[PDB]
Amino acid sequence: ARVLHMVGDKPVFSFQPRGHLEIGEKLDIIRQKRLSHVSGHRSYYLRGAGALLQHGLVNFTFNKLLRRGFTPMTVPDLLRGAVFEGCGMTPNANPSQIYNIDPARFKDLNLAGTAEVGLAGYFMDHTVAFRDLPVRMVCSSTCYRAETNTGQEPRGLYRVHHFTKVEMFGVTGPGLEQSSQLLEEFLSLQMEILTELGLHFRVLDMPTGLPAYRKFDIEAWMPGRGRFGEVTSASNCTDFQSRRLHIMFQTEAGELQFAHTVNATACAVPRLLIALLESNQQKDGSVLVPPALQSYLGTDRITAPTHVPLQYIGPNQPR
Amino acid sequence: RNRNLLYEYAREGYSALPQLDIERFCACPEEAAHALELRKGELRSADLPAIISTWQELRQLQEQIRSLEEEKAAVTEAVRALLANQDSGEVQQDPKYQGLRARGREIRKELVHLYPREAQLEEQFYLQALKLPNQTHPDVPVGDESQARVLHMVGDKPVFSFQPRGHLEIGEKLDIIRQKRLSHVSGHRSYYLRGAGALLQHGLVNFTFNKLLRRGFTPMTVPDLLRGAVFEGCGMTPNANPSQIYNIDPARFKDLNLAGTAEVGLAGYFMDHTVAFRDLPVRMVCSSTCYRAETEPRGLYRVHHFTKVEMFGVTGPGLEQSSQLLEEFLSLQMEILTELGLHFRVLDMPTQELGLPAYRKFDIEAWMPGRGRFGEVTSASNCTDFQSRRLHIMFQTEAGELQFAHTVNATACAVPRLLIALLESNQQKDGSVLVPPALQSYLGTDRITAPTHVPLQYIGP
RNA sequence: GAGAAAGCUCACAAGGCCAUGCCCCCAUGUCUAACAACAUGGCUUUCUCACCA
Numbered sequence: 062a063r064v065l066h067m068v069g070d071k072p073v074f075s076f077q078p079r080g081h082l083e084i085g086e087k088l089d090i091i092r093q094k095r096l097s098h099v100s101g102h103r104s105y106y107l108r109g110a111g112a113l114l115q116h117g118l119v120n121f122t123f124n125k126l127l128r129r130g131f132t133p134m135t136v137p138d139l140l141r142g143a144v145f146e147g148c149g150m151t152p153n154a155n156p157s158q159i160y161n162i163d164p165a166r167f168k169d170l171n172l173a174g175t176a177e178v179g180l181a182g183y184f185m186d187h188t189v190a191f192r193d194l195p196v197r198m199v200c201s202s203t204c205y206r207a208e209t210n211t212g213q214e215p216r217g218l219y220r221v222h223h224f225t226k227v228e229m230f231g232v233t234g235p236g237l238e239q240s241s242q243l244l245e246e247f248l249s250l251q252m253e254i255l256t257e258l259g260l261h262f263r264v265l266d267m268p269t270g271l272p273a274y275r276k277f278d279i280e281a282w283m284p285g286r287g288r289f290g291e292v293t294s295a296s297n298c299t300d301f302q303s304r305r306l307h308i309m310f311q312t313e314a315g316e317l318q319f320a321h322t323v324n325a326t327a328c329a330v331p332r333l334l335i336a337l338l339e340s341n342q343q344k345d346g347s348v349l350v351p352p353a354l355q356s357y358l359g360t361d362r363i364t365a366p367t368h369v370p371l372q373y374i375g376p377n378q379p380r
Numbered sequence: 381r382n383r384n385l386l387y388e389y390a391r392e393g394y395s396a397l398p399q400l401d402i403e404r405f406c407a408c409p410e411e412a413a414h415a416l417e418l419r420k421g422e423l424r425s426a427d428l429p430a431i432i433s434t435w436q437e438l439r440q441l442q443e444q445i446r447s448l449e450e451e452k453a454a455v456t457e458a459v460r461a462l463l464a465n466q467d468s469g470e471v472q473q474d475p476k477y478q479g480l481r482a483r484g485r486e487i488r489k490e491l492v493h494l495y496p497r498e499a500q501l502e503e504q505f506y507l508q509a510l511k512l513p514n515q516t517h518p519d520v521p522v523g524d525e526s527q528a529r530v531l532h533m534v535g536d537k538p539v540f541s542f543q544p545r546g547h548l549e550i551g552e553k554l555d556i557i558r559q560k561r562l563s564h565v566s567g568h569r570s571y572y573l574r575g576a577g578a579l580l581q582h583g584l585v586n587f588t589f590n591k592l593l594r595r596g597f598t599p600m601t602v603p604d605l606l607r608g609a610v611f612e613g614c615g616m617t618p619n620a621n622p623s624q625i626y627n628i629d630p631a632r633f634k635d636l637n638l639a640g641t642a643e644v645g646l647a648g649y650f651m652d653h654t655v656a657f658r659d660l661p662v663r664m665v666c667s668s669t670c671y672r673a674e675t676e677p678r679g680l681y682r683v684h685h686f687t688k689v690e691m692f693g694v695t696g697p698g699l700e701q702s703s704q705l706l707e708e709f710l711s712l713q714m715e716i717l718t719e720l721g722l723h724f725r726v727l728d729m730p731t732q733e734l735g736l737p738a739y740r741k742f743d744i745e746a747w748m749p750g751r752g753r754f755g756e757v758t759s760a761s762n763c764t765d766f767q768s769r770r771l772h773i774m775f776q777t778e779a780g781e782l783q784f785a786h787t788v789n790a791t792a793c794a795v796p797r798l799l800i801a802l803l804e805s806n807q808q809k810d811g812s813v814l815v816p817p818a819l820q821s822y823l824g825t826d827r828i829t830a831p832t833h834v835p836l837q838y839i840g841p
Numbered sequence: 842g843a844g845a846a847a848g849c850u851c852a853c854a855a856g857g858c859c860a861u862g863c864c865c866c867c868a869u870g871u872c873u874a875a876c877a878a879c880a881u882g883g884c885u886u887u888c889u890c891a892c893c894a
């Protein structure tokens with residue numbers, strides 16, 4: 062858990078830090094009241110400034126990655142079981158992070174846990190020209206997690222079943238150095254994005270998961286939580302996604318070989334929303350908008366919504 | 381086997397029981413039978429008399445229950461008040477006390493015995509009644525899809541020197557869309573977007589979002605997972621043998637479904653809530669992925685999953701206001717398609733295909749040269765009285781009264797259909813695809829060229 | 842996410858994360874003339890053992 066780099070300064074607030082959920086409910090941007098029946102449990106709805114923030118962050122990250130040449134891509138939502146087995150996630154175990162579609166209605170259909178599985182499926186059983194390498198593509202899709210821990214901080218926005226996460230996938234040449242430098246570049250890009258937003262963050266190194274040869278976790282300081290929170294995870298892999306999925310790249314000589322795979326997460330909307338709202342939180346509850354996202358939001362300073370908040374007329378209310 | 385989730389919801393007590401429209405047309409049976417036959421929904425006029433008779437019986441049983449309840453409440457209040465005064469053994473010995481106790485016991489037994497029969501009657505009547513469709517606007521033509529009238533057509537088919545090729549072939553040539561040998565990974569009818577295609581999709585969604593945001597629409601995001609009750613309220617069939625909506629495995633999770641459309645999510649968000657009169661009309665624009673089972677042989681015409689921006693708004697109580705809002709939504713669709721430049725014809729939907737929850741529906745079909753037939757890409761539906769009643773969405777007036785509010789839902793654009801129409805319409809002999817001026821800035825390139833990168837080689841056995 | 846327990850949760854006084862007041866769940870049912878009291882279940886909280894690709 063060594064800390065490779067620390068950037069930014071912790072904000073100083075005269076008043077006590079306020080939880081992101083409290084600010085959202087007061088601002089009404091995010092509502093999480095009595096949504097068990099309507100949207101299941103631990104779901105969330107974004108409206109007003111919140112929706113603009115989600116779209117702004119996804120578009121800003123996408124534009125920044127595209128300017129650097131990343132090839133934009135999209136992946137199918139439904140994925141087969143073999144693809145998940147190759148990426149190292151197994152749905153056979155009873156507690157699984159992979160939603161499983163009903164077998165009777167559909168055969169071997171599973172929702173994409175993350176966009177990395179979809180991109181890996183794309184490169185399955187194919188040969189990439191030795192000149193094309195390295196190949197970096199950014200895919201943006203909604204990711205659904207089957208299990209979110211409820212033992213600690215259950216009533217929080219930190220962990221949610223469905224979250225928008227930009228994913229960057231890069232195939233590299235046989236040389237280990239090429240993969241390592243590619244991962245380094247990915248880390249630099251994500252660090253640059255966080256610094257641009259202004260969130261205080263520290264990047265550490267995870268010891269030794271088993272599939273990933275190396276890993277990098279970026280944690281962003283959150284005032285409401287009062288502790289550091291992990292916001293991004295870029296993890297290298299070596300001849301494992303290819304050797305499991307039979308992904309091979311033909312070199313100039315023509316010998317069949319297995320290419321290395323690098324997968325990183327540019328950003329996640331829920332954690333970023335928490336950090337942005339809490340870091341810029343003001344005394345009256347207004348949230349300052351960073352200049353980088355001012356153009357996307359179009360509002361210099363967020364204020365209480367003019368529309369009156371929705372009232373609950375349901376039977377489950379004290380009378 | 382088969383059980384509604386709305387009646388189950390009301391039975392458990394999660395939400396107030398919905399108010400049906402049977403009373404509205406109960407006055408004249410012939411008018412309702414004729415309208416229902418024209419709609420030709422799952423329910424038929426032949427079975428309507430049974431439903432009306434059961435409803436009347438239910439009303440009578442409820443009235444009887446209310447009378448017994450009033451008598452029981454009166455005896456309980458009188459006995460309690462009398463017991464408080466002169467609370468001694470002599471008062472207990474009084475014949476009035478004994479008679480009131482016996483009457484209370486008899487009333488309790490009668491009410492408990494009657495309750496199960498009434499509950500069974502309510503379940504059967506509401507189960508059959510839910511099938512009944514919404515009112516049909518008089519100006520809606522009656523017939524099949526072909527019979528649908530054409531309101532008007534904007535643009536003309538582009539003149540082409542050579543026969544335009546299919547969208548799938550052009551995509552494979554440019555490698556934007558890859559659909560070959562995808563059975564093992566994503567299953568059948570699965571598509572991939574690469575290079576210019578992905579940028580085109582993002583640019584279209586962002587352009588639509590910005591256009592709607594400037595008009596004042598409030599942005600909204602809806603969770604993909606939704607419960608079955610919301611689906612039933614929307615009017616779609618959540619569970620059926622040929623049902624097209626994906627349901628997660630019951631063992632892992634219960635009552636979880638993938639949203640058919642974004643409007644379903646917005647309706648769930650608005651379920652069991654009220655809105656201030658000043659806020660009305662409220663317009664919300666939501667962009668989200670939609671997965672449809674959909675149970676052409678090849679191509680992007682039928683796709684299991686796709687991304688479509690959906691605009692859903694709750695209007696005022698007056699029916700005129702709902703119609704006016706629908707007209708404004710139609711104008712917005714026309715401006716978006718005129719700006720893109722595609723040739724699109726807006727045709728009023730026929731009564732047969734209107735659907736269970738839609739009062740008035742406008743279908744906009746865009747001409748596809750490669751396909752050779754118009755493709756429906758935009759559908760607007762007036763959910764004025766069905767969705768609000770099913771989900772209890774109401775708007776409180778200044779006085780404090782609650783009046784049901786009409787809901788209008790429409791689709792701004794769909795990435796698969798608009799992509800196919802733009803590619804086929806702007807395809808050229810060299811293979812380059814022209815980019816419309818609106819998407820030129822977002823894409824940044826006036827046209828598209830063969831991909832620089834070497835396309836993938838299939839090494840699969 | 843799994844198991845289990847409880848009935849309330851939000852807000853205002855006041856002390857250096859919680860001492861006390863202020864307010865103290867929504868439904869379907871067993872005995873009760875009926876409030877309450879015990880069950881089944883929902884929801885809001887709290888206590889446990891575990892994965893975070």
Ligand SMILES: Nc1ncnc2c1ncn2[C@@H]1O[C@H](COS(=O)(=O)NC(=O)[C@@H](N)CO)[C@@H](O)[C@H]1O
Nearest residue numbers: 177206220221224291292293294325326329332
């Ligand atoms: N339960 C969760 N709910 C919502 N977002 C999550 C969740 N877990 C992780 N994330 C987001 O996803 C990022 C990566 O964590 S991870 O999903 O477990 N690992 C990966 O995604 C890599 N395999 C490629 O992205 C986190 O930093 C956070 O932004």
Ligand SMILES: Nc1ncnc2c1ncn2[C@@H]1O[C@H](COS(=O)(=O)NC(=O)[C@@H](N)CO)[C@@H](O)[C@H]1O
Nearest residue numbers: 641674682683756757758759789790791794797
């Ligand atoms: N099999 C399909 N695969 C991919 N896209 C489709 C498919 N069928 C229809 N669409 C697109 O989705 C749009 C929605 O049409 S619809 O599902 O029948 N009606 C709705 O979605 C309502 N929510 C309107 O707001 C169509 O106009 C078309 O653009």
